[PDB]
Structures are given as structure tokens and as C-alpha cells.
Design a protein around this ligand. Structure first.
Ligand SMILES: Nc1ncnc2c1ncn2[C@@H]1O[C@H](COP(=O)(O)OP(=O)(O)OP(=O)(O)O)[C@@H](O)[C@H]1O
Ligand SMILES: Nc1ncnc2c1ncn2[C@@H]1O[C@H](COP(=O)(O)OP(=O)(O)OP(=O)(O)O)[C@@H](O)[C@H]1O
Ligand SMILES: [Mg+2]
Ligand SMILES: [Mg+2]
Lengths: 298, 259, 403, 298, 273
């Protein structure tokens, strides 16, 4: 057990931006925080840090309180809107950050090319880009041995050839027993890696847990889209009555959603008649779980 | 210690700032200028060995050597906070005082390197031109000047920390920072005369040996007259100026722990 | 009224030398012979309390090793200890010890008198209306008063209209007036001290004199009163601690809060290199006192160091020393031993700077000194006495402190 | 024909960031720039804005050079890592901005509900969230009515409910005659609103024009990942001989990947008589072109 | 105007800078200090509320009224360059030089609002206790004074602008603004004064008070310490300026020309930003 929040709410004077957050964590998990902007995800990891006082409770971070530097060593932090000292060599900033983390200069070299900035290293970071800031912003969290990891929108402005590269690096990190904390706003991609989702409400929490039992309580349809399969008439009248929404288009395709237990039994009959050309089907995803859980309460 | 590392950051920050080492070039031309002043008659540095040029140099240092300290640490917290990157340091395994004093002695070694390359290069300029054989005195009476020169700079640099941690905007930490430069240079010495000119009978002359302690400026103007020639001896006058150092920083450290 | 032969003129040797034996001689002696008075230490003359005890009018008298006590008190009749005519020419007195009521030395009219090493402490029992004048001169040229230790008098050593007049090494204590001068042109006084005196140097309407090396030590409200004396050379002289109070008499003076140098209308005077220490008012001025020379002198300790009363722009500091003002603001700006940074100090700041010497640190703060610079640029307090215009140095005449 | 880049290269000291870039832009077009995180995508916009000088060419934005401010009245812009003066209200920055763009107070009051920050105004920008900063930068781009927009990665920290909302606002601005220049890194979602693509190299351009004809020279396969189509062993060798692959995983799962020409008739055999339990079809997407063009250039 | 919009912005954040509202209180107690003090014997002195004591305030404003202007305009270019709003601000329909003079008089009005209330109480301090003085010459004393201060307060804005147009880091802008406070006030007072004793012992002494106008700050003393004040005597540098035979408004226009040379240099380096 690493991070344990105990019923804590958080205010900004009268602006109580957190409502009664009780949230725990084991020691190998991968967490996904979601929700709207302003829901408190940047406020959440600050409360995991010592940056904010737990107003109506306390946190238990590695069995401890977050104001201790022996507890504040093995975490790994990356914020949103990350910025640095704009006048230095970015390796030298990381060489400056290595002295604060205690890791030697044998780590700063490979981490610069793990995020792949060695082609344009040793320049000013104000002469970098938004990806090149965030790739440098990734690397300071990679210093030493981060047992805890904290990721406040890490994938912003990143190449998708390298966005899932950190996901495999995330997948390389929970195998060696390092629990991460990940919030994101791109909802695809992360679902291969998230062990437990923690989508939360406005000030409150909505739901917790892993992916599949979160799909239980959500009424979830599968989604089928087509364009000119064989017919328009029979596809409408087969699903206006048989427990589905036959959304009645006209280009010889009726885009009917099935209820995801109903695609097992009749899509063998369906696309045998609707002779298929290029048709994709959409499982009710975590993104589809999100908008339900957004609309589950207000 | 990790407190040296942000000071090891800041030595680059006074050199990669090429024009922050070059405040010693400001600090040299006051030294080579008014030594060769001779404003009444000559202008050729006659009594350079005599500390009347040093007491004149100790005079106008009270203008700007507090002010040089005020132009560095006034934004070392709040402009860093408006820069926003200090929270990453707060995630990094640091005490807040360990953040603070390494930010202090980082800037505290900027000007301490700047005096002996600014004034101490001009000591060599006097040692090669005036032909005054003053090896014993200028090793010492400059040292009783120049170690006070960094230390008057050291308290005002700490006096910038007591409000750069307080306020949440940069130009407010330059507006309100001028009030202590208004106080200790211009008006707090002035109201002591206005205290004295009102009470001709009161304000007993044994009180005022402890009223010179309340100004950090005039005690810098008190150890100027060591070699030039007191109710208070010099050794307790050395410690009371650095008594301002400790009571500034923990006042800042309680303020810095409330952001 | 006893004669010279009432005394015993034992002559073991000739050449008109007369040794005297010991004895309790009585009577107001009238010695009328040219006498080498080699008097015994055991010889004590007890005079009878009425009348002058030693009339001497014969010339060529040498008096050594004597004493006398309790002579007359008729001060209108001049009941002195020793009575001297103008006919007593080139007379000498030395080593004389006195504790009697009236005058110590009456001398008038004669020339070339020598008063060498004399312990004349007459009477302090009166309240200085009739304590007695110590040494009264009256137009006596050739005056030599040397090393004379005197106490217990009213108004001290009197000098009236003399011109050969030398005052060397004489110490006076405990008197109303130390030395008195009426109309005595071209005088000369050397190294004389006035301890606990209601004044020490009373000088009226003389001329042409020199004042050398006289130290005024622990005096009461009046150190030196020049009155109507042009051609006044006052050099090397020391002034310490004139203070509060009165003199009791106040005949033509005003003994008050303490004036170290009372100045009353010289036309010409060079008072140069004199020390003045710890008065209340340092320099009294009179408005008719003009054309003066004060260069090289020393002004420490005093509270209101100059009372500038004239309507006059007098500089009186001819390129020497603005005379060591301890309240002189303005450090040595020009890089030499030459100072001369401003004019004199004259304000009310001297009172508190006497009261607090620490505030001269606050004087030379650069916030204050630029405000001091506009006060020299704009004299709102209308003082005609710029009156130094050459401090030009740091410290003169430290050698005058050799007490 | 709005933006006309004419063979332009651009340097930095001695380091170039562009290899002879030529580009056109009409009026109903929507262009999506993609590439590496140092490929030139931020600095391309600054030549359009006239923040830089075209060293090896020129650009006629609306027929004119970009240094004219009267060009910039019909021009809106959002940068990456967008900051404001953080001591002001949300409304006070915009009312300051409305004085610049000449729009009155009757735009900011509804541009606030164009992003839905009606509660969020009259508070300090240093108290805001990531998206609450981002919508303020989104609002000033929509200030007045400009005809050209440059959304330099607009999806920094945005709700995926709200992310498609501005795409509808793009699509509403697309039918209002305003061409929009875009660069992004969330590669799904944008392509339905993309009229033409702008994939480019480290210094070069890679391709231009619409999504359909850029799939022509990018011959990229259509993929079917599944578990239990019909069987493993009988459903294995009848697809590799059809010019395709059939990855015979033992747990009743075949990964048939067709090469996009014989997707017509073979899906009648694949899912017209196949029995669906867990099947996921994959159309060859546009990040796969970014996979392809990175393998083309590099 | 289009230029007024940031000038309308530049008062509001200075209002939001709630302790830059408090710039006037330190700027007022320097007045009501020296209304009631002085060199010696100065407790509650209303008779020495003379214009020479107001001419003392110009010598005190030789130092800090430049320096208040340097602590504002030293980061109105670089502080938003690496603050990350100027590349937003270049998109708005503005010239690059059009935003400089808006930030110039936007900074130029907030101290102009500060100076007329910094001695506005000192105007009423005459009405408070200073009885037996003529308000009509004090109306012309402060009219010689208060508008002359803020143009010198304007002239160190554009000194701070051309350095902050030049440099591209935060602390070096502060590091250079202390430099131009030193050399253009304290050093350049005495370099001419060190010239006139030996190198101008006998060489070329004709056009010497014409050389005074390269320093701008002593002109502000020479405007006010001469003024209509009677004495002007023994003022160590201003006695040299008393030998300058140009009339009174010639000193007024060259300081306004010292605005006019300096804003052109701000238009230069910001175009080369
Ligand atoms: N310093 C502050 N003062 C007052 N309110 C604040 C402060 N910081 C944050 N808030 C409020 O807390 C709310 C949540 O902030 P936070 O950024 O944690 O939410 P979020 O869901 O993480 O948003 P985002 O994902 O865009 O960062 C914000 O809407 C803001 O109104
Ligand atoms: N002002 C500058 N001076 C020197 N070099 C610069 C400057 N600005 C950018 N660069 C460099 O030139 C390249 C320009 O690329 P740019 O900043 O447009 O990247 P990008 O592909 O847009 O990345 P991102 O989309 O992550 O911002 C960058 O790699 C950067 O390192
Ligand atoms: Mg967040
Ligand atoms: Mg970019």
C-alpha cells in the first residue's frame, strides 16, 4: 500500500474544490484519474504531495506524511504546464536535477536519448519545442529510482510514435513494482495499461476500480457503423422491433447499435445478408464509460 | 549537502548571466573613480593610503550595496513562483529552509565574489600606481572594509527574502522592497535626529549605543574608522550585524512555509 | 611703628649682608635701610592685626627666607603685609609665607621689582568683599612676579597702568578675580594657572600686550575677559572647564552660565593657537569687536562654542585653521591633509552634539549630507558669520595638553 | 486562396528548420499539420503570423505579407503552452483583448458560454486549471470573427466531451468560409473535420491534400484482430494464400490482415458466415500514415 | 485609440498591484518629512517651508525618481517575452512600436498619478500647518517641480525600455538597470567635475556648461534649484550650470528631447527583437 487518502476534502477559502475524497492504492497498481477540467486532478496529486494541506483529513503516503524528504525521494513527479529555466543547457538542468535527486551523471546521458533530445541537446530550452519541453519534462521524473510516479497529462504535444513508447516504459515500470499515478485527457491509448480507473466527479468522486467491472453497471451498447452493405429496407425493419435503435439512414446501410450481448448471436445472420466491404465495430470503451459517468451525476 | 547544489546552480546563474558578474565592473569604477576624485583641488589620488577615500567609499556604498542586494533576491522567490518551477523543487527531497538558504548563499556568493574582484582588483591598482608602501594596512584595513561590504550586502539580501516570500507578484516585491531602502538609507537615520530634536531633555545618551544596532546601515559606517583613529566595542559590533542574518531568515522561513 | 633696628641685623659677613636669627618678632616693622634680609626659617613675625606690617621705602632691598602673619585690615589705608614706596627702587622679595587679613603686596610708582617664589595665602574668611587684594601694582615698570603660589584673596593680582610687567609661572587659586589689568600697555604674562577662581584673567583697556601659555584650569564662568584692548597677541594658552554660576561681586562683569572667552572690542588682535576645552559658551563676542585674527586655535568640549552677536561678515581665519571645531561637519573630501570642506559650524546642533557625540555618525550619512549641502547652498538661518572658510586640517596643538 | 507559402526554408543561427517548404491554402480547407516534436510545426505558424522572417522565400497570407496589422484583424491565433497575466479576471483579460480586436462587450459574455466557463470567470488565472487556461486561449481565438485560425495544438488538457465540441465549432467555422490551420497530436477524432492533411518531415514536407488520395500512395493494410471468428485450424491457410496474413494463435484466434484491395469479397467469407464473439476490425488510419511517412522519411 | 488599450490595461494591473498604489506613501513622507525637518534645530519648522526646502526635494529626487522608473520599465519587454505573452500580442492588430508607447505612457501615467498625489498632501500640508506663506508662488514652485519630476520619471522609463528591448533575460535587465542608475547619475556628475580641475586646467574652458546637458538629471536640478529662487550660491555642480546662458524653456525642451531621442531607440531595438 502506497498512497492512502482518508475522506479528505479540500477548500480554497470557501471554494471547496474537493468533496470527501477517500482513495487508496496498493503497491504495483496503475491508476487512471479522469473527469472534466477543474474536477481536481491537479489538486489531487498536490494533496498527495506536500504542496497542499489536507484540510479535512490526512493522506498516508508510503505509510507516512508527505512533508518528509525521505518519503519525497522515491516519488517521480511530472506536472501539467511544465516549464524550466529558459537559459540553460537542458542536460545541465538535468545535471542540476541529478544533484537534487542524488543520481549520478551516469543516468542523465541515456535518459536524454531515451526521450531522444540528444540531437538538439545542450541548447537553451526556450529554443526547444512543446514536445521537447515535455520530453525533457519526462526525464526529470525518470531520475534515480522513482518508486512512485505521478503523471499530470504526460502525453501532451508528443509524437504518437513516441507516445506509446512511454506507455511501454510505463509497462516496463509496473513490472518492477513501481506504482504510478496517471491522469490523462486523451482517453484512447491508456486502456491497455490502466489497472484501475478512478474517474471522479466535480468535487466528488464518481467511481473506482478496474475496467471490466466498471462496464457492469454502465448500460453499454456495442457500436456498428456501415456504408452500403447490401440493403436499406430490411435492416431498418429487423431492428426497429428487436430491442435496438435502428437508426434509419439511406445509403443502403442502417447503422444499428447492438447491446454488446446481442452482437454474439445475430451478426452472423446480419452481415451474411449485409454483404460487408469495410465495416468497423466499436466496443463500449472507457471513453464511452467516461461520458456516461460524466452524465451519471449532473 | 543538497543545499550547496542550488548554490552550485546559482554560480552559473551569475556567470551565464554575463552581465551579473559585470556588476563588479560597476563596483570597480566607484573604487577607481573616487579614489582619484580630488573634488576640491587636484583629482590625482593623493591621500589614497589615508582612509578618507575609504570613508568616502564607505559613505556611498550605503546607497547602493544595499541596493545591489535588493536587485537580486527580490524575485528569487516570487518571480520563481511566477515562473512556477519551484514546486518541482518542492517535490525534490528538500527542506524549505534548505531551499531558502541555498538560494541565499547562492546569491550570497555572487556578490561575495563580486567585491574582491571589483574592489580587490582596484586594491592592486593602488598597489601599482600611488607607490604607497602600505602592505600591512591595505591587507587589513581593506579587509575590515570589504568583509563588511559583503555583510551589509548579506543582510539586505536576506531583507529581500522576508518579502519576496510574502507577496504573490513581482513588481509588488520591487515596490515594497524599496521601503526598506527608503528606511535604512534615507529616512530611519533621519527620524532619529527628529527624535533627538524634539526631546532635548529626554533620549538619554546611554540608550543610543543600542540604537545604532537597530540600523544595519550605520554599523557599516562604524568600522570604517578603525584604522582612521567608542561606547560599544568592535567585536560585539561584528556579531550584531550578523545577528540580523539569523532573524531575517527564520522570519522568511516561517513566511516561506505559508505559500 | 617698630623700626629696622627692632629687628636684629646680624652680619657674620659684610657687603651689607644681614643674616637674621629665629624668633617671634612682634610689631608692625618699618624697615628703612637697604637690606639683604637673609631671614631665618625659624623667624616668625607675628604682626598685631592693625597697620601695615612691613613699610619699606629705602631702595636696594633683598628679602629671602621669611614669613609674617596677621597684619592690618584697613584696606582704605592700604594695610598690606609689605608696603612699598616709589622710592623703594630695584627692591627684591622672595620666599615669604603669609596668612594675614589685608593685602599681600602693595607696590606703586617704583621700577624693577622682583617677586620670586612666594607663598602668599592671605585670607579667605571674608565673602570676597574684603578678603584682600593679593599683589597690587600701580604704574610699576620692571615688574617681575615669578613662581608665586597664592591663595585666599579678593580679586587677586592687581595691575594698574604698568609697562614693564612680567608674570612668569605664578599659580593662583581660590579667588574672585585671578589677575586684574587696568590700562597697562605692553604687558607680558607667561604660564600662569588659575584654579577654582570666579574669574582668572580680567583685562581692561590696556594695549600692546602678549599672552603666552597661561592655562585656565577649573574656572568659574569667566576664563579670559579682554576689554578694550587692541594689539592683543594671545598664543599658546589653555582653557579648561568654565562652568555655571556667579562670582558674587559682578562689579562690571556678568558671571553666568560660563563664557570661556569674553571679548570686548579689540581693534587689532592675533589670538593664535590656543586651546579651549569643555566650556558652556566658548566664544563670547561683542558687536564692536572687529578686525581679528583667530587661526590655529582649538575648540573642544564647549556647548555653544561661539556666540556670534555682530551684524558682520567677519572671517578672522587667515588661511590657517578653522579652529578645530568638534562640531565641524564634513569629512576630509579632498585627498590630502588639506580639508576646508565648508564654512564654520554655528547652529544649535552643537548642544546636542555635545550631549550626544554619537550623532556625528548620523551627521555623515549620505542622506543627511546632501541635505546639509543645500543648507550651505541656502542659508535660511541668516548668519553673517561664515567665519572659518579654512578648517584645512584635522587637529592642531595637542602639545598644549601637557599639564 | 488564403495562405501561399513559396518554397521557403528557414534557419536558426546556422541550423535550418525547413527544407524549401511550399504550401497553399484556399478558404474552405482545414489543414492538419503533423510530424515530429521538433519538425517545425510550431515555427511554421510563426512565419504565417509574421513572427519570423522568411529567409529563403515569402508567404502571401490573404495575398499580403504577414507584417501588416490590417491583415491581422481577420486573423485569430492560439499558441501552445499559452500563458496570460495571471493576476486578472477571466473576463478582464478578454475585455482587454476585446479592445485590441475591436469587438464589444457583447462577445465575451457569450464566448464564455461557448466554452462553458460561466462560473469560472472573475477569478485569478493563476488559480485556474489547465483547461481553464486553455479555454481562455480558445476564447480569444474566437474573439471577433476572424477568417483564419491557427490552433497550435489546441487539445492541451481538454475534456473529450469538450474536445469534440470545438471540432463542431471548427465545423461551424468551416461552413462560415473561414479556413482553419491546425496541428495536433491526438491523431484520432480530428480527421472527420480534416479537409486536407499536412504531414511533413524534419525539414521537408511529406504529403498534402485530402485524406483519401493520400491513402493511395500509402498502401497500408486493413487489419482484423479477433478471437473466435470461426476456428483456428480450418481458418488459417485460406487467408495466407489470398495475398494476406493469418496469424494462427492457438487459443481460437486468427489475426487476418488484408491488404485493402480484397477487403470487398473476403469479408463475406470472414464475417458473413463467421461467428462473432470477440472480433475487432481496424481500418488503416491516419496515424498509421504517420507511422508510414516516418518510415518513408527516416 | 488603438494605443490606449494597453494603456487602459496598464493602469488596471497597477491598480491590481495594490502596493504600487502604495508607491505614493513613501513618495509622500519624503515631502512631509522635510516639511518638518532639516539640518539643525528643525522640529516643526513652518518658516523653513521655503522653496529652497522644496529645492532640497529635487536633490533627493535626483536618486530615486530615476530609480522608481527603472524598477517599472525594466521588464515590460523581457518580462512578457519570456513571460510568454508577446507572441500572443504580436498577433493582435498592432505595430511592434505601437505597443511600446502604450506601455510607455501606461507606465508614464501611473507615476504621473503618483507624483501629483505624492505632493498633493504636501500641497495641503501647506494648508494644514504652514501659516504665513504665499500659496501663489508655491503654486508656481510645485509647477516648476511636480511636472518636472515626472518627465524625468518619464525619461528613465525609455532608458529602461531600450535595455529591456536589448537583453533577453530577466535578471540581466535588472542587472543592467542598476548600471544605468549608477553611470548616468552618480558617475557623470563627477567626470565633468574631475575634468574641470586638471584636464580643464587650461585647455578648452569655453563650452563647458554646454557639456552639462548630456547628463539629464542635473538639468532637473538646474530647472528647480535656480527656478525663481534667489541665492543659488556655491552649489558645487550647479554653479557651473549657472554659467550656461541659454534661457529657461531651453532646459525644458531638451529634457523633452531626451524623451524624444530615447523613444526612437526603443523603436529601433524592439524592431530588432
Ligand atoms: N490556487 C487556487 N486558488 C483557488 N482555486 C483554485 C486554485 N487552484 C485550483 N483551484 C480550483 O480548483 C479546481 C480544480 O483544479 P485542478 O486543475 O486540480 O482541476 P483538474 O481537474 O486537475 O483540471 P485540469 O485537468 O485542467 O488541470 C479548478 O477549477 C480551480 O477553480
Ligand atoms: N527561437 C528559436 N531559436 C533557435 N532554435 C529554435 C527556436 N525555436 C525553435 N527552435 C528549434 O527549432 C525547431 C523548431 O521546431 P518547432 O518548435 O516548430 O517544433 P514542433 O515540431 O512544432 O514541435 P511541437 O509540436 O512539440 O511544438 C525545434 O526543434 C527547436 O529546437
Ligand atoms: Mg488537471
Ligand atoms: Mg509544435
Amino acid at each position: 500500500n502506497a498512497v492512502e487518502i482518508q475522506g479528505v476534502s479540500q477548500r480554497y477559502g470557501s471554494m471547496t474544490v474537493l468533496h470527501d475524497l477517500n482513495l487508496n492504492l496498493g503497491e504495483g497498481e496503475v491508476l487512471g484519474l479522469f473527469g472534466h477540467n477543474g474536477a481536481g486532478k491537479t489538486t489531487s496529486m498536490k494533496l498527495i504531495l506536500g504542496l497542499l494541506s489536507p484540510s479535512e483529513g490526512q493522506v498516508k503516503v508510503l505509510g507516512r506524511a508527505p512533508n518528509d524528504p525521505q518519503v519525497r525521494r522515491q516519488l517521480g513527479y511530472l506536472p501539467e504546464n511544465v516549464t524550466f529555466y529558459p537559459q540553460l543547457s537542458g542536460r545541465e538542468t538535468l545535471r542540476h536535477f541529478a544533484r537534487l535527486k542524488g543520481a549520478a551523471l551516469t543516468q542523465v546521458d541515456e535518459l536524454l536519448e531515451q526521450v531522444g533530445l540528444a540531437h538538439a541537446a545542450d541548447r537553451r530550452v526556450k529554443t526547444y519545442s512543446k514536445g521537447m519541453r515535455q520530453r525533457l519534462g519526462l526525464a526529470q521524473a525518470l531520475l534515480g529510482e522513482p518508486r512512485l510516479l505521478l503523471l499530470d497529462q504526460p502525453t501532451v504535444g508528443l509524437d504518437p510514435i513516441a507516445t506509446q513508447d512511454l506507455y511501454l516504459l510505463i509497462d516496463r515500470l509496473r513490472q518492477r513494482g513501481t506504482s504510478i499515478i496517471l491522469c490523462s485527457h486523451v482517453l484512447p491509448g491508456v486502456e491497455a495499461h490502466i489497472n484501475r480507473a478512478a474517474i471522479l466527479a466535480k468535487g466528488c468522486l464518481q467511481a473506482v476500480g478496474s475496467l471490466s467491472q466498471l462496464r457492469a453497471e454502465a448500460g453499454l451498447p456495442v457500436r456498428i457503423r456501415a456504408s452500403g452493405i447490401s440493403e436499406r429496407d430490411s435492416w431498418l425493419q429487423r431492428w426497429t422491433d428487436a430491442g435496438h435503435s435502428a437508426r434509419g439512414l439511406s445509403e443502403s446501410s442502417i447503422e444499428v447499435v447492438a447491446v454488446n450481448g446481442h452482437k454474439l448471436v445475430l451478426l452472423r445472420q446480419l452481415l451474411g445478408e449485409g454483404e460487408p466491404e469495410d465495416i468497423e465495430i466499436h466496443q463500449p470503451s472507457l471513453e464511452d464509460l467516461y461520458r456516461y459517468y460524466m452524465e451519471r451525476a449532473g | 549537502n543538497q543545499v550547496w547544489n542550488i548554490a552550485r546552480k546559482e554560480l552559473s546563474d551569475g556567470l551565464r548571466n554575463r552581465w551579473l558578474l559585470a556588476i563588479s565592473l560597476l563596483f570597480a569604477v566607484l573604487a577607481v573613480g573616487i579614489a582619484w576624485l580630488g573634488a576640491a583641488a587636484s583629482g590625482q589620488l593623493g591621500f589614497t593610503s589615508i582612509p578618507a577615500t575609504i570613508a568616502s567609499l564607505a559613505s556611498l556604498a550605503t546607497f547602493l550595496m544595499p541596493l545591489i542586494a535588493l536587485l537580486l533576491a527580490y524575485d528569487a522567490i516570487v518571480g520563481e513562483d511566477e515562473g512556477g518551477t519551484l514546486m518541482l523543487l518542492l517535490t525534490y527531497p528538500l527542506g524549505r529552509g534548505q531551499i531558502l538558504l541555498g538560494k541565499f548563499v547562492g546569491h550570497g556568493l555572487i556578490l561575495a565574489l563580486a567585491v574582491l574582484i571589483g574592489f580587490g582588483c582596484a586594491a592592486l591598482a593602488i598597489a601599482l600606481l600611488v607607490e604607497g608602501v602600505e602592505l600591512g594596512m591595505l591587507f587589513w584595513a581593506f579587509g575590515r572594509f570589504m568583509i563588511s561590504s559583503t555583510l551589509l550586502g548579506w543582510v539586505f539580501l536576506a531583507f529581500a527574502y522576508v518579502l519576496s516570500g510574502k507577496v504573490n507578484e513581482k513588481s509588488s516585491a520591487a515596490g515594497l522592497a524599496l521601503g526598506v531602502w527608503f528606511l535604512f538609507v534615507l529616512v530611519f537615520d533621519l527620524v532619529l535626529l527628529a527624535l533627538l530634536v524634539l526631546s532635548e531633555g529626554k533620549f538619554n545618551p546611554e540608550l543610543l549605543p543600542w540604537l545604532l544596532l537597530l540600523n544595519p546601515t550605520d554599523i557599516y559606517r562604524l568600522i570604517n574608522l578603525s584604522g582612521f583613529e567608542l561606547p560599544v566595542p568592535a567585536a560585539v559590533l561584528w556579531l550584531c550585524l550578523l545577528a540580523w542574518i539569523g532573524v531575517s531568515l527564520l522570519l522568511a522561513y516561517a513566511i516561506f512555509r505559508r505559500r | 611703628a617698630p623700626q629696622s633696628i627692632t629687628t636684629l641685623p646680624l652680619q657674620p659677613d659684610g657687603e651689607n649682608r644681614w643674616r637674621l636669627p629665629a624668633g617671634e618678632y612682634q610689631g608692625q616693622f618699618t624697615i628703612e635701610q637697604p637690606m639683604q634680609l637673609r631671614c631665618e626659617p625659624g623667624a616668625v613675625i607675628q604682626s598685631q592685626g592693625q597697620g601695615s606690617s612691613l613699610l619699606i621705602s629705602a631702595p636696594d632691598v633683598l628679602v629671602e627666607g621669611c614669613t609674617l602673619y596677621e597684619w592690618g585690615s584697613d584696606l582704605t589705608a592700604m594695610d598690606s603685609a609689605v608696603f612699598i614706596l616709589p622710592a623703594a627702587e630695584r627692591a627684591q622679595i622672595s620666599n615669604n609665607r603669609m596668612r594675614g587679613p589685608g593685602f599681600g603686596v602693595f607696590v606703586d610708582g617704583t621700577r624693577d621689582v622682583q617677586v620670586i617664589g612666594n607663598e602668599i595665602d592671605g585670607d579667605a574668611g571674608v565673602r570676597s568683599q574684603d578678603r584682600g587684594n593679593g599683589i597690587h601694582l600701580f604704574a610699576v615698570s620692571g615688574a617681575r612676579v615669578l613662581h608665586n603660589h597664592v591663595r585666599n584673596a579678593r580679586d587677586g593680582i592687581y595691575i594698574d597702568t604698568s609697562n614693564g610687567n612680567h608674570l612668569e609661572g605664578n599659580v593662583i587659586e581660590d579667588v574672585r578675580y585671578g589677575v586684574h589689568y587696568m590700562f597697562a600697555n605692553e604687558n607680558s604674562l607667561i604660564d600662569n594657572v588659575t584654579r577654582r577662581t570666579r574669574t582668572g584673567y580680567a583685562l581692561m583697556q590696556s594695549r600692546k600686550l602678549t599672552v603666552t601659555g597661561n592655562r585656565s584650569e577649573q574656572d568659574q564662568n569667566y576664563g579670559i575677559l579682554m576689554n578694550y584692548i587692541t594689539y592683543s597677541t594671545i598664543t599658546g594658552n589653555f582653557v579648561s572647564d568654565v562652568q555655571r554660576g556667579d562670582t558674587g561681586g559682578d562689579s562690571m562683569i556678568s558671571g553666568g552660565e560660563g563664557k570661556a572667552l569674553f571679548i570686548y572690542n579689540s581693534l587689532f588682535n592675533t589670538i593664535e593657537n590656543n586651546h579651549f576645552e569643555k566650556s558652556s559658551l566658548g566664544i563670547h563676542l561683542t558687536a564692536g569687536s572687529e578686525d581679528n585674527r583667530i587661526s590655529g586655535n582649538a575648540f573642544v568640549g564647549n556647548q555653544q562654542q561661539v556666540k556670534y552677536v555682530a551684524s558682520r561678515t567677519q572671517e578672522w581665519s587667515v588661511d590657517g585653521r578653522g579652529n578645530y571645531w568638534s562640531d565641524y561637519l564634513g569629512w576630509d573630501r579632498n585627498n590630502d591633509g588639506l580639508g576646508d570642506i565648508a564654512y564654520e559650524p554655528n547652529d544649535n546642533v552643537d548642544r546636542l552634539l555635545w550631549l550626544y557625540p554619537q550623532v556625528r555618525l548620523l551627521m555623515n550619512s549620505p542622506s543627511i549630507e546632501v541635505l546639509r549641502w543645500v543648507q550651505r547652498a541656502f542659508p535660511v538661518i541668516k548668519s553673517p558669520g561664515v567665519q572659518d572658510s579654512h578648517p584645512l586640517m584635522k587637529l592642531p596643538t595637542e602639545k598644549l595638553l601637557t599639564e
